[PDB]
Nucleic acid binder design. Sequence first.
RNA 1: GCCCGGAUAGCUCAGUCGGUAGAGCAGCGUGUCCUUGGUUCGAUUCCGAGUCCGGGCACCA
Lengths: 1183, 188, 393
Amino acid sequence: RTIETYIIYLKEDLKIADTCKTIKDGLLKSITDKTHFSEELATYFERDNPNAPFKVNTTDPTQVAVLKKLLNALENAEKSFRAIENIAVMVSYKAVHEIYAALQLINHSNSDIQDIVGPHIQKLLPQMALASKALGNFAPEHPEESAGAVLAGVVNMLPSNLIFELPHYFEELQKLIMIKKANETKYYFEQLSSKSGLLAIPSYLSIVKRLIAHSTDAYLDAVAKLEDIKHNILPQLISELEMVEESMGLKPGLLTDPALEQMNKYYTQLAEQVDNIALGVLMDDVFIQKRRSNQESRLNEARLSSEDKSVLAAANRFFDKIGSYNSIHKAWSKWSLANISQSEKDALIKEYKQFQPHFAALYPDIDKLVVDALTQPTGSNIVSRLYSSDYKQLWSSDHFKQVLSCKDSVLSSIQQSLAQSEFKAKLIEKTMSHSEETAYSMNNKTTNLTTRVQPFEPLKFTLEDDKPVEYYHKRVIAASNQILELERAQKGVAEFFNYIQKKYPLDESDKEFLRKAYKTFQPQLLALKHDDINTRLVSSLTSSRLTDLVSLKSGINDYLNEKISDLNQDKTTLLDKEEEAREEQYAKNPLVAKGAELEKQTLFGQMSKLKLSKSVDDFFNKKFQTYLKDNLSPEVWKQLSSNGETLDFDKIPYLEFHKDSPEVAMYKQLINSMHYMKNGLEKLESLNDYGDPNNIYHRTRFVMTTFNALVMNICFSKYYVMEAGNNPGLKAIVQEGLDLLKPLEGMPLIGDYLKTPPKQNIITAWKKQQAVVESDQQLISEQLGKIQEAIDNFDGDLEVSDSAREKIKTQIGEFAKGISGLSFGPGSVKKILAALTKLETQLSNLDKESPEVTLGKLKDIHSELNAQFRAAAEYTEYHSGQKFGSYSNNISTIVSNFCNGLVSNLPKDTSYLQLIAESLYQIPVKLNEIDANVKAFVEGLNGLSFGPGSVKKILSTAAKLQMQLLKEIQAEFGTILMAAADNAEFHLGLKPGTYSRTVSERFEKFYSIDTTSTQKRLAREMERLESVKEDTSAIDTKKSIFGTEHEQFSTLYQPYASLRHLHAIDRVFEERHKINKPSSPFDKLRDLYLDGDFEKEENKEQFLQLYAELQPHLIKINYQYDLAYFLRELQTPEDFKAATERIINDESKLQELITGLDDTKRLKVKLCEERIGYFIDLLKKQE
Amino acid sequence: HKSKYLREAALEANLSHPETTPTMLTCPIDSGFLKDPVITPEGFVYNKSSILKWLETKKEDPQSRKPLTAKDLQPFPELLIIVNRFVETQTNYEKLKNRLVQNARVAARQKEYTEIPDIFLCPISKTLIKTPVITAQGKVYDQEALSNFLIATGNKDETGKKLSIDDVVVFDELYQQIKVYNFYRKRE
Amino acid sequence: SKEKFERTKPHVNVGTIGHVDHGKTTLTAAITTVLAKTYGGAARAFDQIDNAPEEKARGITINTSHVEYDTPTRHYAHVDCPGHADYVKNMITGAAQMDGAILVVAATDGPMPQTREHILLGRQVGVPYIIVFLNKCDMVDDEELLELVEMEVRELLSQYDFPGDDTPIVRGSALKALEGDAEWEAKILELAGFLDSYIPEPERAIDKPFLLPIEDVFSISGRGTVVTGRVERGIIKVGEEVEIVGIKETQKSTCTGVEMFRKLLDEGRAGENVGVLLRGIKREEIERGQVLAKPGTIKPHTKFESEVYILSKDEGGRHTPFFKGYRPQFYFRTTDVTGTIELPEGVEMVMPGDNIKMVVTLIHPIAMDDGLRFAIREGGRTVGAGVVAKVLS
RNA sequence: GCCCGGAUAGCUCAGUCGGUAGAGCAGCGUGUCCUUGGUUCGAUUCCGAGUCCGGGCACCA
Ligand SMILES: Nc1nc2c(ncn2[C@@H]2O[C@H](COP(=O)(O)OP(=O)(O)OP(=O)(O)O)[C@@H](O)[C@H]2O)c(=O)[nH]1
Ligand SMILES: [Mg+2]
């Protein structure tokens, strides 16, 4: 029974298998886009068959490997969940924790993978958390183990900036082209410098400030500033963008081509303006050289890191030496690495110092074990080191076995890092090719020469006796970049002479190719004594003997060969000296554990280091409760604080919420949300603080469940905080708490995490839930499948791409989902199936008719089907007891969207305030910016009611203002705002005056005798007190739940209930209706329980009607008395009996609810009396 | 004075190391080799492409400061005839330099040498070169092993040629090659 | 054998437990040699305890070793147990023959995983009293560290219902005492005094039907087969009939001689570590875990309902839940049997640290009774500790 | 008691870089590979434990 409930909860509510399939398909389609990501990364995910798992080799990049593992985890989770739906607890647990293992892989990944994966993987985090919580109900009950927030209805809240920001910024600066240029610059600075959340380029603020300053402005200084912009700032920004798109893995030029075009326009218009006031190409010669030099530096670092084999060799030696101990040797060492000989320890330390980062990243605890075993002196005792219990557990184990079990993982990590470096090098190579293509295209597809370029001087060799590692590294990279320059020069001369040989076996026609080839090796030709030849070639190539330059080809080739050989020799020598310096620096430093430092940085360690719980507690204790005391009236504050100045912290997690006023209950809920938020943040920080130097931190997949549960609780409490924050008097402090939690939006594994209600008949809802449990619809599904297969089988002249096939299949799925919730009348299903058959016949004959006839026929089909679906939806609405015009409009919208898709892929008081602000702004401007001021005024005063009566007054005042276009209109607007403010204040428990004076101040600030306004507000308050005195909600609810016979029915019903628990015993049961006739839903339910014959459907329907009557009151006592999940569990008559008993046993809580309503009226009358006292005091004092 | 200028430029180039390009042989205005020099009535070396820019700011001699016009400052190729031979001598000197380094580079990577390579051995000391110094004609000695030898036999050497310390300067490329050789042998 | 083992003093079964390489064997040798210096004694050497070629090669104790000594008012049979995590089972068997344990904790190390594991397992097999011996105190001169070890061991003992605040702790050095340093022989004598005083003489069951868990079986050449163990209850006499009950079908046999540390005994009493000769049984027809019982007084069972606490990850237990069909190993007094587990209604997965009322059915019938504690080990670690709530079948 | 090695269809077996079990016989195989756990994105495969089977050591109340 419970397992069936769990299965249905997975299949229907969470829809975990469908979510996993959608996430996997979206991630795979995005990473194989070929328009957002490059082909190198895309080809790693090409599969022979879609049923085979991706294979993670040792030769694929780290990010490709982690993406493959994540995709495989998603596929296996979907497979397991689908297998569960095809029929359990163990399989669901395993699938959930496989997803959690993938999440842990993401946690330990870098920023690039995290941002690639986060948008897709954020869709199932709440689903995973709810699945884990449902699984937890199969474990033994553990009260107080969690004690977190009560997740009432979280199932309801189940849910390109980088490429556009720089173009938008440079468009804004293009727009910035006496006093006019004095506020526009400040406006742009405020608009752009305030923007954040995408500054992965860790300098962007410097660039934006520098461009603003330089665009604010003899001509030599201006030219110097222009050249500095063109050569120092803009190339640096372009290079940083290229590094972003290289680490990302995107296609060459994805987010650097639009930005480049934008800044090209910006710099060209700057140059034009400067020329007008008194060169500018952005790719003249040296921008290209600097871009290429940065690209080559990155490429050479990548190639050096890829070709390095010292770390892998050291790891191999370490694991070979560890594996050289047989059983006898290990027994002699007592299976501890600390008991081996000192020379062996020195060798192991030398090996481990070179690959410690990988080992510590994968195994942060075995790293500590190794470091302590190898480096701690043997004289020292274990007890004096103060090890923790689990560290001692790791210490007592076979050290050799533990270290050897990490061999495959560590070696795979090292080889995958090398493969990642090589893959990045390939990415950079394609980046340079694409940059060359774009630079060629941007100017004219033509290149220009100049006989003034400095010659190519090979770097001088200098072998410093002893310098830090970075010094030799810089020299090595300089040598490698020079090698690459010479290599390009030799390729250029080869192509130059090949084209010369093949074009004329110097007054030629195709001089562009010769120019582009000679510009590659001009410095090298200039290095030799060939200035005359170069100056003769440049002019003869830009304006016009080639038979003589062919002579000095072997000389140039041998010079390039000799210089590249020398640079290769020197790079090898400096690499050897780098190895020596690295060995010396490793020898100097001691061996120190690195596991905790890496664990502190993953994703949750970074969040934990923010210590947001401390700030949340500070706000909760120092700023929140003091504001509550200051602004809440003493009557409502006495409920929250027994002492008068501090909250009742001994009872913060309130659990009743039904014995209080709506304002008191809302305040208690807000306090509960703040408390849960603080506790969750502090628990997440404690579980991710790694500051114990005598402890080990094991990397496992089974901690992610706790992290996800804590994140879910935090986000649910924050949801309720913003929900309670949409009140006029509570916006400030709630916004302050939101600003405190601001550094939680942006983290990939939390994100928004949440969303950030029809009324149908009770019998209809119960039948729908029963149908959901037990799961024309088959007919329409088959018809849609036939349509889809007819579209897919279209092999006519009108070729249809597979993308259009996917689009039509998705549209068919959406249409099936939309129509699965419709009931069709007699003959309506025949009409809709005939229309669908005609549609599929037309689709099978798309190429058999002209496009005009095809579009006309499909439009007619769309119209007919939409009309039939409106008729069916209206019939369903009438038969389901819903409200007309709600479901039919949605059905028509779905049908219209589906038809538009197929035709495309086949070849409010807020408005009142807005108009008030617009009229008030247009009044003086027509009798003597506007949109921004109106928007600010509306935003600052969002959340007012205006009532049904003041709407007419506002309309009349606006009409009078229009007719007249002095302070009477202003006074009327002010008093209407004040009345709305009093309404808002009395709705809360606020002290009189506060929000009203705040809104009055805002209104008068936006604007740029009081006795009557004060008297009017006093009359408003007096009539409010009278209306509150006239309220009888408590009596009404009491009578509705049980009439004026509850006591009598109880008295004559207790003996019957006692007798219920022999032949003539039923006789009185027959006569009980002659003396105990019910008149109230609760007494009717009591009689229904006394009947006890729940097999019949008549009293089942009667119970459904009674529960429909009693639900609006039962929902306040408990959240489980809903109309979706409570009815879903009513399947057997025993379930009906159990539900009847459950509702029966809450009579004391209905009494508590009605007493709470009475106390609500009692508090309200005191609020009005205090208010009127305050206004009469203000009126008498003001004179 | 036209002949005396080239006479003393020739002696200055001859006595000095050919790799030390004289600062007067190159035009001081542009610091470039003589390819288009001009003359003055007294006789000085400049460049036409540089003299046209210089005379615009100051219509006088760059060095003697006498008021001079562009008409008199005519191209003087008589100073070119020496320059070429000098530079080719320089080139010929460099024609050994690279080779004297290139083999050295190979010598820097050879293993298990039976004896110290000849290019690494000082002929006047028969020992490993600590700091190499290169003669004006293309031979390499050790700095101290040449200084002490010269002061022992009175600034004479080999065939009694007038050679002194100031006329022979350190060989930097060979010095770095010696450093590489020492670093590689020290690895054992 | 030769002597007759005259009965003069109360006999107590003690043993040494603790983490690997903490000095249990050295402590046993030191106790024997010091009691031989001060009294009659036998003065066993270290090489006479860990004498097996496997133990000599590995350097560790692998199987339990049995010695005896005599204080002025008591006679002790001492079981030296292995401390390596791989031979825990052997320890358990030795821990089944202990009326008391000396928890040897090295002062240079403090309590370790096997200290806690041995405490829990000895509690499960019925060790009711523990005396801590702070060994290697000659290598630690600090006094704060000694008190830190003392408080840690006391809290560990109280964690498993032992009276940690009352447990005696002896700060000695078994290596020095074996060497002959009188200052440390005084500490060993204090330990012997604590053994005499702190551990009470148990109330033996000499009237109940005879019961003997089997710990070891020997094939004495020319005589037959011998089963050794501590008589749980009753008296076994020469010529009486016994039955073997346990893993296989129950067999019948006669007792034709009882010994005790290679000395002829007329009758083995309850609580005494004896050895019994069985007539006409091959060594391959008997295993450790079976039971010598009076004919027709013990019925082996396969299915029992039990209350089990599942250890947390911090206690050396599981770190993941287990589901239905989990097949761990159940350790009763000298027996270990594989069993399947059925969870109570509404429970599907058991988290570490949980308390469960589970129904366990074993693959072989074993002699067990209501209220018999047991351990649950799987994959080389102790995963739970339970008590047989009732016997189903 | 401590090692070592096997267990894959009804029978004989191949499956080793960890990616959904196949060759013959027998009459087109839900054979998750003895079972149970662990590690892993993923286990017939790697690690551990246990159940049978075998053949090497041990001890000897
Ligand atoms: N310094 C010092 N060393 C000791 C002391 N007691 C034992 N040792 C040494 O610790 C080592 C442990 O050997 P055992 O006494 O046999 O340890 P164990 O308790 O039997 O542990 P297992 O052999 O694994 O069962 C021996 O080699 C002794 O030399 C002591 O009191 N002081
Ligand atoms: Mg021992």
